[PDB]
Write a protein that binds this ligand. Sequence first.
Ligand SMILES: *[C@@H]1O[C@H](CO)[C@@H](O[C@@H]2O[C@H](CO)[C@@H](O)[C@H](O)[C@H]2NC(C)=O)[C@H](O)[C@H]1NC(C)=O
Ligand SMILES: *[C@@H]1O[C@H](CO)[C@@H](O[C@@H]2O[C@H](CO)[C@@H](O)[C@H](O)[C@H]2NC(C)=O)[C@H](O)[C@H]1NC(C)=O
Ligand SMILES: *[C@@H]1O[C@H](CO)[C@@H](O[C@@H]2O[C@H](CO)[C@@H](O)[C@H](O)[C@H]2NC(C)=O)[C@H](O)[C@H]1NC(C)=O
Ligand SMILES: *[C@@H]1O[C@H](CO)[C@@H](O[C@@H]2O[C@H](CO)[C@@H](O)[C@H](O)[C@H]2NC(C)=O)[C@H](O)[C@H]1NC(C)=O
Ligand SMILES: *[C@@H]1O[C@H](CO)[C@@H](O[C@@H]2O[C@H](CO)[C@@H](O)[C@H](O)[C@H]2NC(C)=O)[C@H](O)[C@H]1NC(C)=O
Ligand SMILES: *[C@@H]1O[C@H](CO)[C@@H](O[C@@H]2O[C@H](CO)[C@@H](O)[C@H](O)[C@H]2NC(C)=O)[C@H](O)[C@H]1NC(C)=O
Ligand SMILES: *[C@@H]1O[C@H](CO)[C@@H](O[C@@H]2O[C@H](CO)[C@@H](O)[C@H](O)[C@H]2NC(C)=O)[C@H](O)[C@H]1NC(C)=O
Ligand SMILES: *[C@@H]1O[C@H](CO)[C@@H](O[C@@H]2O[C@H](CO)[C@@H](O)[C@H](O)[C@H]2NC(C)=O)[C@H](O)[C@H]1NC(C)=O
Ligand SMILES: *[C@@H]1O[C@H](CO)[C@@H](O[C@@H]2O[C@H](CO)[C@@H](O)[C@H](O)[C@H]2NC(C)=O)[C@H](O)[C@H]1NC(C)=O
Ligand SMILES: *[C@@H]1O[C@H](CO)[C@@H](O[C@@H]2O[C@H](CO)[C@@H](O)[C@H](O)[C@H]2NC(C)=O)[C@H](O)[C@H]1NC(C)=O
Ligand SMILES: *[C@@H]1O[C@H](CO)[C@@H](O)[C@H](O)[C@H]1NC(C)=O
Ligand SMILES: *[C@@H]1O[C@H](CO)[C@@H](O)[C@H](O)[C@H]1NC(C)=O
Ligand SMILES: *[C@@H]1O[C@H](CO)[C@@H](O)[C@H](O)[C@H]1NC(C)=O
Ligand SMILES: *[C@@H]1O[C@H](CO)[C@@H](O)[C@H](O)[C@H]1NC(C)=O
Lengths: 81, 55, 163, 50, 280, 198
Amino acid sequence: NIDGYFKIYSKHTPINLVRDLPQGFSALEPLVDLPIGINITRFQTLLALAAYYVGYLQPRTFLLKYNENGTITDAVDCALD
Amino acid sequence: AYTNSFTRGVYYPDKVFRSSVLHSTQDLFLPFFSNVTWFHNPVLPFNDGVYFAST
Amino acid sequence: FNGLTGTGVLTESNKKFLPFQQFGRDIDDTTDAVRDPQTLEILDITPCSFGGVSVITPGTNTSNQVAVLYQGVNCTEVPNVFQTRAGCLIGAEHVNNSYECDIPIGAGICASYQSIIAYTMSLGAENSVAYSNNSIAIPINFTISVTTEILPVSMTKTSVDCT
Amino acid sequence: PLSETKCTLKSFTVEKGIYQTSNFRVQPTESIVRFPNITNLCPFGEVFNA
Amino acid sequence: MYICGDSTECSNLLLQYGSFCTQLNRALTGIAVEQDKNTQEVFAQVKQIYKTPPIKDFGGFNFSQILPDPSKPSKRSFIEDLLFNKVTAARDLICAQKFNGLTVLPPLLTDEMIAQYTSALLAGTITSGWTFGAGAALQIPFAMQMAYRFNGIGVTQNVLYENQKLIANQFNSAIGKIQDSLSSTASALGKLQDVVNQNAQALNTLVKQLSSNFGAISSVLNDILARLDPPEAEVQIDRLITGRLQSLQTYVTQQLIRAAEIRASANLAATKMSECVLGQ
Amino acid sequence: LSSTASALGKLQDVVNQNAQALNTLVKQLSSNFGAISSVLNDILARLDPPEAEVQIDRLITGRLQSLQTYVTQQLIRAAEIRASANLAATKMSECVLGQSKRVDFCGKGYHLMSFPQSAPHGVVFLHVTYVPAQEKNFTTAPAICHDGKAHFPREGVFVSNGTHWFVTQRNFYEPQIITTHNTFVSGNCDVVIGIVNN
Ligand SMILES: *[C@@H]1O[C@H](CO)[C@@H](O[C@@H]2O[C@H](CO)[C@@H](O)[C@H](O)[C@H]2NC(C)=O)[C@H](O)[C@H]1NC(C)=O
Ligand SMILES: *[C@@H]1O[C@H](CO)[C@@H](O[C@@H]2O[C@H](CO)[C@@H](O)[C@H](O)[C@H]2NC(C)=O)[C@H](O)[C@H]1NC(C)=O
Ligand SMILES: *[C@@H]1O[C@H](CO)[C@@H](O[C@@H]2O[C@H](CO)[C@@H](O)[C@H](O)[C@H]2NC(C)=O)[C@H](O)[C@H]1NC(C)=O
Ligand SMILES: *[C@@H]1O[C@H](CO)[C@@H](O[C@@H]2O[C@H](CO)[C@@H](O)[C@H](O)[C@H]2NC(C)=O)[C@H](O)[C@H]1NC(C)=O
Ligand SMILES: *[C@@H]1O[C@H](CO)[C@@H](O[C@@H]2O[C@H](CO)[C@@H](O)[C@H](O)[C@H]2NC(C)=O)[C@H](O)[C@H]1NC(C)=O
Ligand SMILES: *[C@@H]1O[C@H](CO)[C@@H](O[C@@H]2O[C@H](CO)[C@@H](O)[C@H](O)[C@H]2NC(C)=O)[C@H](O)[C@H]1NC(C)=O
Ligand SMILES: *[C@@H]1O[C@H](CO)[C@@H](O[C@@H]2O[C@H](CO)[C@@H](O)[C@H](O)[C@H]2NC(C)=O)[C@H](O)[C@H]1NC(C)=O
Ligand SMILES: *[C@@H]1O[C@H](CO)[C@@H](O[C@@H]2O[C@H](CO)[C@@H](O)[C@H](O)[C@H]2NC(C)=O)[C@H](O)[C@H]1NC(C)=O
Ligand SMILES: *[C@@H]1O[C@H](CO)[C@@H](O[C@@H]2O[C@H](CO)[C@@H](O)[C@H](O)[C@H]2NC(C)=O)[C@H](O)[C@H]1NC(C)=O
Ligand SMILES: *[C@@H]1O[C@H](CO)[C@@H](O[C@@H]2O[C@H](CO)[C@@H](O)[C@H](O)[C@H]2NC(C)=O)[C@H](O)[C@H]1NC(C)=O
Ligand SMILES: *[C@@H]1O[C@H](CO)[C@@H](O)[C@H](O)[C@H]1NC(C)=O
Ligand SMILES: *[C@@H]1O[C@H](CO)[C@@H](O)[C@H](O)[C@H]1NC(C)=O
Ligand SMILES: *[C@@H]1O[C@H](CO)[C@@H](O)[C@H](O)[C@H]1NC(C)=O
Ligand SMILES: *[C@@H]1O[C@H](CO)[C@@H](O)[C@H](O)[C@H]1NC(C)=O
């Protein structure tokens, strides 16, 4: 949520490993941009008749690399080492 | 139950095409080699945007 | 297109834009390709032709006619048209000879008075020495020559105040 | 062109050589403006054609 | 063009800044002319254009590595091909121009005449020694030329005439070794790549300088002109108009400063060519 | 020199460059720079001290920028002239006061002397050079072996006019009869290429 604009990114890719998050890269493409204008602080997930990771977004600088077809192949974190 | 998110959480920042170029971007990203909290009803806070992965 | 402005020449394009991805951009952060928001077709943009203008003259004291050189542009669109690799001349006639030439033009082409002819400059007279492994050529008569050269050493001393 | 050379050099005699006079740009013949389709018109007959 | 393209009010505002558009063009023209003079000063030192004869009786020495090959793309002599391939066609069309008043002019002398000059110098050196720098070239056997050059450093001539085969073999082996030295190592050509990198980076910085607010509302002239009223928008324009002048002046000054040292190096190269090649 | 003009190009170019720089600097003094007028006295006599300072500030900053530009350009030009003066000093010390054995430094040929002459803002040299001509080519030989001993020439080169052999200096045709006094022996004539009996 950026200054009243809710943006949704996503990705659906099959994975070979079944242990944890595999090693590799997978970019995300925007789908929905909605300016409702609600400044949120708590959220939940609902169900009917398991396991979901959660991470927090922080300001940073990256160095993205684009291939010949405009798809990110890799990125470098700037203030790491 | 912290897990090291190796190289996950990178998205296209802007609605612009680019080919064979290296781009320096400043946006809300997930820092590399960070900790993700494994979960299993439990409500979670929403600071400024959440990266939600699931099986 | 979709608010962004500019001036250029539009051409059909065959790039590989991603379905959600609108328009391209060059290395120097300059627009290079666009997607038209009516039929979703890739399109290319070329900067419009522009360039300097030069005048080649043989001197007012000699004659009163000149040639006009348009640097750069492929001169199909310019209001004896001779096309070179640096713009194109107007007012000079091409020849198939090569002379050690007067004032240059560029890219090996140069022009001179005769009535303003443009050609390709020649390095010099061509000769081949008759080399062998059993003969030497020795001079018999010498000459003494005098050569002048000019070297500046200083200029005028000028002082400028502020107040 | 000779008169332009004389004016830009600010003299009545020009020696042998090449001089630059000005630059030229190909002016735009017309303008093109493009916008997406005009959908989802506001309902105005509810408060007018009622 | 660079300060503000295709705008009328911007041109009217710029016209009141005096003539801060003419000395820039004059300085750039002076640099461009001096660049052609630098190239003309070094190579153009031979009167005629000599060529090597089909005779290849050089006493054992093998110059085929450096003599031009007729069955070549541009009559270049093997080594020059490696030199050109190790540095990062040029005839396709005329489109070397950017969006915002950036033009690149072609050099007066193309590579063909440079190759012809070098070939003429080499052929004169081989078939005439140092006699082609003073007056007219006189033929002389190559072995005798080597003998006199040995005599020029104190070593008597009869060293050559009794050790010709060993010296020929050593020369051929050295020419063979320089081949591998040039082909394998890429860091050797480290003085011709710096100029290209510096010029490209300077031009890139100049282009990227355009998208800066400089204290105005936006970095695009059209939006400011078409969103503010004329009587008020004048103040915002004359911040960009002041920033672009500073950027362009900085670029011009840096170009002059870095061209001075190139001129010095070209003069040194001319001296080396005139003294080390045409003589001993 | 008396008839053909336009030979003193460099000095004229220097003078023209300096004069044109001064002219543009002086001409720059007549621009509004966004103020009301290009003369201080008019603004001074028309406006009031509290609100006449903005125009003066604009004029001051514009003129200061122009003056800085002129000074920098003059510094570059002075450095170039310094380099030229250093070269002229070297030539004066090395060619006038002696003889130059380095090729194509003073003239096109074999140098003999020079004479300096003054000029409005520089110096002019008059190099005297030696240049040969009227070529003629003979047949040569590396060394001549007699009585089983291979003789080489002390200083010169072997030539022949069809029948006989002579020793000549390199840069002039002076035939001399071959003698033990101007040839030195070294080894035997069995490993040299080009030995000629005589
Ligand atoms: C960029 O897109 C092109 C498609 O235009 C990709 O080229 C295809 O590559 C696959 C993989 O071998 C081939 O099976 C197709 O035949 C290719 N298409 C052609 C030749 O038209 C190219 O690989 C892509 N580059 C990437 C993803 O880096
Ligand atoms: C707006 O409406 C027009 C029709 O009025 C759409 O044009 C169609 O475009 C598709 C491909 O994009 C073609 O296959 C159809 O033939 C077009 N229709 C006609 C009648 O020619 C257009 O796609 C719509 N959307 C936009 C953004 O313009
Ligand atoms: C040096 O000797 C050579 C060969 O004997 C001369 O070269 C040729 O001279 C003939 C004279 O009839 C010309 O027809 C040829 O064209 C010459 N060869 C070439 C390649 O031009 C040469 O003239 C002699 N040198 C002098 C000064 O007479
Ligand atoms: C060497 O050159 C000089 C000058 O070129 C020759 O001297 C000339 O000889 C002719 C005939 O005797 C005279 O008419 C000229 O007046 C002389 N010139 C001068 C400057 O006095 C000289 O003969 C040549 N030597 C040889 C061997 O050819
Ligand atoms: C309300 O009804 C009127 C009467 O029909 C509409 O006006 C006409 O509508 C038709 C059909 O769209 C058009 O072809 C005519 O050009 C309209 N004429 C005028 C004078 O408007 C009107 O569009 C309807 N809706 C509203 C909001 O007024
Ligand atoms: C001069 O050197 C060249 C090397 O460039 C020699 O040419 C090579 O000779 C070897 C020996 O058989 C061949 O295997 C190569 O294929 C040749 N290469 C080329 C490009 O020709 C040449 O033989 C040498 N000549 C002399 C007289 O020494
Ligand atoms: C100047 O432009 C013309 C055409 O615009 C060039 O001539 C060729 O024209 C055909 C037909 O349009 C094109 O397919 C070719 O690509 C053009 N040639 C090239 C090299 O692009 C002409 O060559 C251009 N002038 C120069 C010096 O390149
Ligand atoms: C080569 O030079 C020699 C030496 O000058 C010539 O032989 C002399 O010729 C003259 C008359 O031409 C005789 O008087 C002498 O007796 C000869 N011998 C000597 C030792 O001087 C010879 O004729 C010349 N050959 C040619 C072809 O010019
Ligand atoms: C100058 O070159 C010629 C031709 O290359 C040499 O003559 C050759 O000498 C060798 C050595 O005995 C013979 O095997 C060849 O048959 C000769 N060639 C011909 C065409 O007869 C001559 O020896 C060389 N002279 C010098 C001093 O190097
Ligand atoms: C030069 O003279 C030498 C010695 O007089 C010659 O060498 C021998 O001469 C004799 C007598 O004519 C021959 O029978 C031999 O065959 C020669 N060679 C040897 C190895 O003894 C030589 O032939 C003469 N000519 C040259 C060109 O050297
Ligand atoms: C976001 O929170 C601030 C206070 O932290 C609040 O003033 C603002 O209104 C919120 N944003 C929205 C869109 O309500
Ligand atoms: C992740 O957690 C481990 C264990 O508590 C800790 O050592 C590490 O520093 C943490 N890293 C981050 C980025 O929080
Ligand atoms: C014009 O040129 C001719 C030949 O170059 C010359 O004789 C004449 O003096 C020149 N006239 C002027 C006024 O320069
Ligand atoms: C030069 O020669 C070619 C063919 O030899 C010919 O086509 C061309 O017209 C000639 N150029 C001129 C200016 O006559």
